[PDB]
Every structure is written in C-alpha cells, then in structure tokens.
Design a binder for this molecule. Sequence first.
Ligand SMILES: OC[C@H]1O[C@H](O[C@H]2[C@H](O)[C@@H](O)[C@@H](O)O[C@@H]2CO)[C@H](O)[C@@H](O)[C@@H]1O
Length: 480
Amino acid sequence: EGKLVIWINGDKGYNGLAEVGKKFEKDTGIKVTVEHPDKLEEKFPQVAATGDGPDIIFWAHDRFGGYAQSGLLAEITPDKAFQDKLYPFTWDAVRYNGKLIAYPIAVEALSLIYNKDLLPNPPKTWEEIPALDKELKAKGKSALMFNLQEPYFTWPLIAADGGYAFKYENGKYDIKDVGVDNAGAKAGLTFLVDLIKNKHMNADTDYSIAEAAFNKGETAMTINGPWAWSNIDTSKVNYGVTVLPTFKGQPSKPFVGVLSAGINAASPNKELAKEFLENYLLTDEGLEAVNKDKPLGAVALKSYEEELAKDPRIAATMENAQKGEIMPNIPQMSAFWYAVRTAVINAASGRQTVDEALKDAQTNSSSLGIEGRSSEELLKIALQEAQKTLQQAQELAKKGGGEEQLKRALKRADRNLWAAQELAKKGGGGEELLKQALQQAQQLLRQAQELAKKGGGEELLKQALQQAQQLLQQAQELAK
Ligand SMILES: OC[C@H]1O[C@H](O[C@H]2[C@H](O)[C@@H](O)[C@@H](O)O[C@@H]2CO)[C@H](O)[C@@H](O)[C@@H]1O
C-alpha cells in the first residue's frame, strides 16, 4: 500500500533494476524491493492466484497469455505517445485477446558464443561439431556445452529441420496441431542424442555447469542469451557472439522471447507500478542501469536501441532472432514447455528413445467432451484447494510448534490432491504427464509429513512444500 515488490529471474540484472528502484524511491517515497525467487514462472501464478505475489513480474512474454487468462494481470493503459516509443512488434508480443497485458522491455534470442582463442573460426554447421570435439578433446577441452535441462536451449536445433510448437494458421494458433513429433523435430533431437551417445556432450550438463566451463576456458563454445555476456567479460575469455550453426542446411530457430513486465491484478499499487515502468524503467537511463548489470539484448525502447545498435553481439542476437520465431503467448505454452522438457531429458538420459519421447510430448502438449470439460474444471478446483491448504501449511512451518495443526493441514491438502488424481485418473489418455506431476507432488507431501513427525528438518520441510506447490501449479497448467 506504499511499497513496490518486483520479481525478476536470477539470470537478469536485478541489481541494476534495484538502482532504478532507488531513483523511484527518492522521487516518490515508495520503497522498491527487487526479488529473484527460484521457479519464478511457476511461483508467480501460484501466489497471485490467492491475491498475493509481487506488484510487478518480469518474464519472457510466452508465460503472460496464461497469466492474463487466469486474471492475474492488470490491464495496462499506456497512451499513444508512450506506445510510439517502443517497436510495434514488441507490443504485439504482449497483446492477449485484443488487449495489452504487459510492458515490453527487450528482445532476447540465443546465440552461439565461442572462445576466440580456442576457436578462431566457429562452425557454420552442427554437423561439423563432432569432428571438432574429437580434435579439441586431444587438448583436454570440449567443443560445446550448454544447458540440456531447459528445452529453451535445445529448441533451436529441434526446430531447425521442421520442428514447431503450435501450428499458426488463420491468424491463430491451432492447439490441436503440435509439431514436436514430426520428422524435423525427430532429426534434431536424434542429432543431440547422438552427440551424447558419442560422448561429445553430457546429458547432465545444466546452466551453471556450461557457464562455468565456458568462462573457465574448458569448452570452445556455449549457447546462451545476452544476460550471460556480463559474466564472460569478468572472466579471462576473449569471446565472440555469432549466428547459431545450421542443421541440414537450415538455420537453427531459437524461440524468441520479449522480456516483459506485468502488473499483478492483486496489486494495491497499480498506478505507482505504471509510473515506475513508464517513467523510470523504460527510459534510456533506466534500461542502461539494468543493461549494465546484465545485458538485455535488443531493447524495445527505440531511443536506447539506437545506442546499442553498434554492438556486434547485438547484431548477432538480432540475426538469430530474425532466423527464429517469436514465441506464442497462449495459455498452452506451459504444457508445451513441460512436455518438451520431459522429452529432451528422457531422450538424452536414455530413459526413452527419441521417437517414444517426442510421441509422448506430442500427446501431452496437444489438446464426451463436455464430460471432460466438467471434470477438468473440478480437477482445477481440487488443485486450487490443495494449493491453498498447502500455502497454509507453509505458514505453520515458518514458525511455531503446531505439529498437530501442520499435520492436519498436510492431510487436508493431501485429501484434495488425492481427489485430483482420482479426477485425472478417469480423465484417460493424454494426461499422463499431469498424472505423474500429481504423483510426484503426493510423494513430497508424504515426505513433508515424515519431516514434520521427526522435527529435525525444519528447512527441508519448507523446501518439500515449495517443490510440492511448484508441481501442483504445473499440474494446473497441464490440465486440458
Ligand atoms: O526452457 C523453457 C523455458 O524457456 C523460456 O525461458 C527462458 C527465458 O525466456 C529467458 O529469459 C531465460 O530466463 O532463460 C529461460 C530458460 O531457462 C520460456 O520463457 C519459459 O516459459 C520456458 O519455461
């Protein structure tokens, strides 16, 4: 009621954003706190659904259509003059059902980052990387390392030869036509899996491992976004940023995200949030402050983009963006991402073959009927009740010794979760991923009950409850 809370991902320039907040605080008297919670994309909708959460949330635009559909975002009202300050295509990215639901900040696209000293001439094709790695392994180095845990990083290769999320036709995205299991997607993922099988990459490589390896000069290349350049400048690596390699003669196609800022519909400070975003952040000085901390990439603000236009790294970011595709913002994007995430991890680990993995990804992300609609809504209600009861258990876990109360709260949450599994069970095929999420959530709740009964793991209890909430929210987004 007199303070602004902002949530932004941990890989962005939250410290630079805090500086913009200090300037706002000096002019208005409103304190601005910037936070970077883990699993932010899932945490926000969970807490905002109950009327809580930050006043402002930052994330690529793909998650915003789902937030808007759930009524978690306030309608933004920038006047014509302000709108003219940003590129029209960035505004298009934050339009849902005909209305603007967030403020665009920057255009992000993955690029190939390489060590100029280990590799003066980067590979123009993915096909030449296996031979390049064998050559570098002789020097105790590797050719390429990038996050294989988030599908965002493998998607450029998957889409290169034909893979796609939702087919765009008639001006809309057909949620029944998913392209994660066509020949193009299979070819791309098989190539990735072959790199692992042939020991050119490790299936367990995640974000931090690849970043540390590249910045320490252990690998010749990595695939990342503009936010990562800052840490590379700090290291002793002479790097270049360029176009991603082609696959079967076609450009890699990264899914392009427009980092955007939305205003929580539950915020009691909507006018102050608008003032902060329009008059403080979306100004040359404001974006400069954030950019200085962690590069934003190409920005939506025309005046500042003109100051970044001479940066070769930004030209590369723009080239890759032009070759990729702007992500859809439809509510089904969460399910798509989770489905593909599961498929890539299973195919990479060997749990499933590429064909099996992508077949399930297609079934899980793709959408008698009435009966399904009724049960779907009831399932969502059961999960919302479970999330609410759970959020209460998290409170009893913060302080106090109400072991009896916490036990009851977890049981109630558990009963509602069990009811959802029952409703999903009868749901039939197509919701296998949803069922596994609910089952995993159940395990965590049982583990939480055990911890509460033993009392020697207060922190582990909170952690188990948060992981449970995260899975329940993902389950909500998987429901169809
Ligand atoms: O990997 C799936 C994930 O991809 C995108 O998330 C990106 C985000 O856009 C970037 O700003 C940066 O934070 O890296 C993320 C990947 O770890 C989608 O925006 C997100 O919805 C999706 O789950």
